[PDB]
Design a protein. Structure first.
Lengths: 754, 788
DNA sequence: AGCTGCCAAGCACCAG
DNA sequence: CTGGTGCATGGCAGCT
């Protein structure tokens, strides 16, 4: 009652689940905090049932809360970034731990996926790149120094963890890292001279190790993510492009929702990492392209088999951590049994990279056979109770089970002997913890129980008895069952000793298999959805013949209107007039997604695409202050290799201010930055730009008025727009006729000056 | 699939399927012994929803029947989970006696828990109404009716068009919505929770009239002012039928219905309710709302009333003057009254349970506690000079007789349920004391028998006990049980003990048990009798709770007016608003820096203000605070200014800026009058430069020329600052800002005339746009300024 | 104080 | 017809 307080002092920053019979119960500010986060009641007490702790842990873990469980003492802790149990994770989403800190120079950043051992490090130069890395990686738990000056970056996030500055010390970090990987220096990983990144990585690794209190043999590498390697996209751009998340917070009507028909959870997670990290290096890209074309035919044969491999990545983490439960080993075995078939289907594929994926996939004949012999066809969830080791694997175990079954058989025949011998049809032998084995007669017959029967328990409508004969065989049964259970466990632990020396090759296999899932999926998508392989050019350019928006074309059952685009150094900017209504916005967004998909190595939705090198993609599409802030970010960071998409800036202030800013932005983008730009606008005055300056041109969307409506066509045409539609839309909407007549008069007089 | 005709089924499932056929779309809890049972798909869904095992009930012919269930004593926890997810549940109980039934015992559905018909304290939120509504659409309009079942408040309206109806659904936010099958305007209603499609015949007018008249004890509905209102009666008739089928008892707290006419209140459109953040902020939460600031009531029933008032400003001048006078009269009495009023609690909802015959012992206890506060309240209120307050004091009643009854009937802190007894107090019923006397000369008797028999046998482990399964016993340990009297009759054997019975203990077992059941039966009969004695006074009781709720509300507005520095507004004959040193009641309490008070002068000669000023300058706030001040004035409340004079307002419209803007605008243009307050916040969107502005201009014209509404017109279009020149009624005001050096300061002060200039370039500059780009845009701007 | 397993009260089922 | 057995979740006896 009183001894909760002292144990809450031991871990004050973490929710304290306190065992109390059938529930775990929280008090003080833990009670308040848990009641609001879990839709359960306050009293200051709260509670959850034992049978569904893991179901409530996972929701608290999902919202950034660590949880200490007190069984007395704190015997378990789960932190949001360091879980690896399947019950606590989402199958198709990464769950990362991260660490951030700040020099007078710049930022250091590390992420770890504790289930795959995927360990990354980076060194963002400034505020904006740092924020872009946080949105992209979206860590479930975020370690930061007490020192941290730029709290604006992390303030709102879940799972913040304030750490002392000495956890970020260079030399401790190097030593910890060199020890984890078994190296003398980090040159082999290309991070030796990246001290900011390393300091973050040393804090992260220390915190991971302290949460597990176990070696982490699956974390054998770290890699550095350099800015120049990827197409940079800021938070706002990422969100607007609706890559994995839609604007409304969901996962549907998203690029992932269309491109992601992978068949294994590890493949779905890898695909989403690729979509969020397009790379500038055409070499990787052409190689992915070639794989996708080469696998076109083999797709229907590959995917059903690949689905049976399952989430080998996360199973392997539990092997590494030595928490892998029997059905984990059963599914690892099930995946090993897919490998030969997969190897046979891939043998033909004329593709150097598919053949490398084929080798790296491996076979593991020995381990397949080991687990075939070692474990039954479908074992229970836990080793705990046995019935998991297969008969014929250990001579000793088969013998103990035989002695148990033979004692148990004698007792069933004892039941039949005592029964027909006494003439009592209700007579039977049962078993429970309180009495072990007993003979049960019903009340009504119990008064004819033989006098040698020692009564031990009266029930409402039966009596139970023991005899020495019954207790003798109980001993045989329980001591046999008991040694067999201890043997099962020791044999199971030994499977871990035999499996674990092949961990490195096994992680290489699950990675290959995950990649194969991604590429085989993208191949099925390209072939299915009528995509085409884009080509790369030396100079900045985008030439698209009949491009579509990859999401909108699947998601609406209206025909989708494909469109050209021609951007070069000689034609760098299009001023897009006409109604928007989603037509311009869709056209600009589909441009960015074709760029993104090209630079992920996927085929693209078009008859043809040629595309030059892109460093960054900016899409300001969707207060005045925020439009202007995002515009400011484009004008400070865009280059002649950037793709810029602006959506009618100037809205939200005066006509002349709005037009002056738009004109000065359009001109800056065209003559100073020279970025490749689609500048959507409502200002007809801006269509005079092509005649004042080189490299700019007018396109537009039009609309046809028929019947009692107006069809907003989505066809992009050359030249400026020569009609507006605000008044036509107001008329349809029921604005009184006399008001529109007056608006039309007013419109003519305002426009006739300009 | 098995052909499961009637004859193929067992008597149990014959009975169950007849019952389920009367509740085909909703879960049925079927009482079978100690369990509520669900079958077939109900079992599978219950299993998913409630987290319970899906099992089977064996069958000799045909298929095995899917089953899930809960023991009867756990039912309330399970109904709560279901009601939270908007599920309805038919509760079916056993009526007959199994011992005198050859076949299955008789079973009826005795209630149906649905999201809008709950009245139990654990299933509701203290400070939020939970309404059942019904909606109906005509060739020409809407019928709508609401019921708060846990108060009896029954309302009827006839919104004339789509937007009024939308605004009504937003204001009332029904937890359950019964609608007619031929409803055409589904956009109003889909994606609403607790949606219940109903057959047309449930909205038939003669049936409605007939049921409502039957319910109220009347021949016609003339005295209620709804005889006139068949569109509304149809919705009300459906509602009343639903209420009666869910509760399956009489509903004597539903003694009245009232029509809500357009003219009796200020109709706020949907955008206005949202944009003023009355009880919900613009991100769905309750923080930083008008209610969060104004609502320091001390009773749940008063909290709800205050929110209903905030949502329905009244236009009756007399009612408003009375509330205003109450607020001034009571200002010194707030610190005294509030701690007492708090102790009354939620008498409203308790009397609902009383009416429903559902009230638990702690309900009658709290009702008794409330009666005990009435004397102290009467005394505090006699001194207060105010006819309205004295009217409430009298309405509040005293109920000395019923207070006395509950003090004699029930113990001080009774248990949660009457099921286990221990509720009725000593001395109230002599037959009950007489029965208690027997099952109580009990543990004194059993200790005596225990010591007597231990000392007589000389067996020192001998104890006396009870066990629900085997009854009373004499226990002796295993090692001493071979020494027990030969008289001792073996009753129950255990591992290390043996339990026995003797005739004297068996007789004492029979007398204690038959008398414990007799005492419980009589308690239950006396407690049901408590209802029969309270119920005849239900009308006055309901009026007392209403008074207490109003008192709570008004006392609160007094305290708020004092603490937050509000003054009494005055009303005038003609449309107009005159504010001196007015403030946004909510923004001024959250801002960490002083609030800049601002004037307003609207009148029939000065009825439209074009408001300019920079982005972040305070235009929206100024417009909102105007509406909030009107709103508070028209609930009787004092108001956040130094002085306010305001004429009659029929309706507040808001448009805060594609087909939706233009449709909303048209609605304002078709339905505004010279008595309407209209807030247009930066409207006018088109596809080209002037397209949208031209519409805003023509719209302003129509508002000034034809409608003559009091209109506040925030705009970024400088071209509209020319409107005063061209049209009577229109004037320019602006929010002051100063540009010193390289930067803008926002003064937040309204001044007459057009702003000096627009400030988009400066705002863009402040947002980080490169200096080089701001230089070039200034150059372009001066080209444009040289045109005119 | 923890863990296991009987029992509630209707009804149908199942062998004899 | 008889005398037995199954059957959800939660209460708590009975054993440790
Ligand atoms: N009278 C006032 N005194 C102090 N601050 C104010 C006042 N009115 C508005 N503000 C502040 O200025 C900010 C912007 O106000 P807003 O009405 O939205 O300006 P606008 O509509 O012109 O863009 C608000 O956050 C509010 O806190
Ligand atoms: Mg505004």
């Amino acid at each position: 009652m009183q001894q909760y307080l002292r144990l809450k002092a031991q871990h004050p920053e973490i929710l304290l689940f306190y065992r109390m019979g059938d529930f775990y119960e929280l008090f003080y500010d833990d009670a308040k905090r848990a009641s609001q986060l879990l839709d359960i009641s306050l009293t200051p007490m709260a509670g959850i049932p034992y049978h569904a702790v893991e179901n409530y842990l996972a929701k608290l873990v999902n919202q950034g809360e660590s949880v200490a469980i007190c069984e007395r003492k704190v015997v378990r802790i789960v932190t949001p970034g360091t879980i690896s149990d399947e019950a606590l994770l989402q199958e198709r989403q990464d769950n990362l731990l991260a660490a951030i800190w700040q020099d007078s120079k710049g930022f250091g950043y590390a992420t770890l996926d504790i289930s795959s051992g995927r360990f990354r490090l980076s060194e963002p130069a400034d505020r904006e790149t740092m924020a872009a890395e946080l949105q992209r990686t979206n860590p479930a738990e975020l370690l930061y120094a007490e020192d941290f000056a730029e709290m604006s970056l992390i303030e709102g996030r879940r799972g913040l963890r304030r750490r002392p500055l000495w956890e970020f010390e260079i030399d401790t970090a190097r030593q910890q890292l060199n020890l984890q990987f078994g190296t003398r220096d980090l040159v082999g990983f290309g991070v030796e001279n990246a001290p900011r990144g390393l300091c973050a990585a040393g804090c992260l690794l220390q915190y991971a190790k302290d949460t597990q209190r176990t070696t982490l043999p699956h974390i054998r590498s770290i890699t550095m993510e350099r800015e120049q390697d990827s197409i940079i996209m800021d938070a706002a751009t990422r969100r607007n492009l609706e890559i994995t998340q839609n604007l409304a917070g969901g996962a549907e009507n998203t690029l992932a929702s269309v491109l992601d028909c992978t068949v294994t959870p590890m493949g779905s997670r890898m695909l989403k990492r690729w979509l969020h990290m397009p790379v500038r290096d055409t070499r990787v890209l052409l190689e992915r392209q070639q794989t996708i074309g080469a696998l076109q035919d083999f797709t229907a044969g590959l995917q059903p088999v690949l689905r049976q491999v399952g989430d080998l990545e996360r199973i392997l983490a539990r092997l590494a951590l030595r928490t892998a439960r029997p059905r984990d080993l059963a599914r690892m075995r099930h995946a090993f049994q897919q490998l030969p078939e997969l190897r046979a289907q891939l043998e033909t594929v004329d593709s150097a990279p598919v053949q490398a994926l084929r080798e790296k996939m491996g076979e593991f004949a020995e381990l397949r056979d080991l687990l075939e012999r070692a474990i039954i066809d479908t074992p229970p969830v836990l080793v705990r109770d046995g019935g998991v080791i297969a008969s014929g694997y250990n001579e000793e175990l088969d013998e103990w089970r035989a002695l148990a079954d033979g004692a148990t058989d004698y007792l069933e025949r004892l039941e039949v002997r005592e029964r027909e011998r006494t003439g009592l049809d209700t007579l039977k032998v049962g078993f429970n913890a309180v009495h072990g084995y007993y003979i049960q007669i019903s009340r009504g017959q119990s008064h004819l129980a033989p006098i040698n029967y020692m009564r031990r328990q009266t029930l409402k409508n039966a009596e139970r008895y023991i005899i020495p004969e019954l207790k003798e065989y109980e001993d045989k049964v329980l001591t046999s069952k008991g040694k067999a259970l201890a043997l099962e466990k020791q044999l199971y632990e030994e499977l871990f000793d035999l499996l674990l020396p092949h961990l490195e090759a096994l992680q290489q296999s699950a990675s290959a298999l995950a990649e194969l899932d991604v590429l085989v999926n993208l191949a099925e998508r390209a072939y299915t959805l009528n995509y085409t392989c884009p080509t790369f050019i030396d100079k900045p350019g985008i030439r698209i013949t009949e491009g579509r928006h990859p999401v909108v074309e699947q998601v609406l059952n209206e025909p989708f209107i494909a469109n050209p685009l021609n951007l070069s150094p000689q034609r760098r900017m299009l001023i897009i007039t006409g109604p928007n209504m989603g037509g311009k916005s869709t056209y600009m967004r589909q441009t960015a997604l074709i760029a993104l998909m090209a630079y992920i190595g996927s085929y693209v939705p078009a008859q043809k695409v040629e595309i030059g090198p892109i460093d960054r993609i900016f899409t300001r599409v969707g207060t005045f202050m925020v439009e202007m802030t995002e515009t400011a970010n484009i004008l400070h960071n865009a280059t002649e290799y950037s793709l810029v998409l602006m959506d009618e800036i100037g809205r939200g202030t005066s006509t002349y201010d709005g037009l002056s800013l738009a004109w000065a932005c359009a001109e800056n983008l065209a003559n100073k930055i020279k970025a490749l730009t689609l500048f959507a606008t409502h200002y007809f005055e801006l269509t005079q730009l092509p005649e004042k300056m080189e490299g700019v041109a007018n396109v537009h969307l039009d609309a046809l008025e028929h019947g009692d409506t107006i069809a907003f066509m989505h066809s992009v045409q050359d030249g400026a727009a020569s009609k507006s539609y605000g008044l036509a839309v107001a008329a349809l909407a029921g604005v009184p006729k006399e008001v529109i007549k007056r608006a039309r008069q007013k419109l003519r007089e305002l426009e006739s000056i300009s």
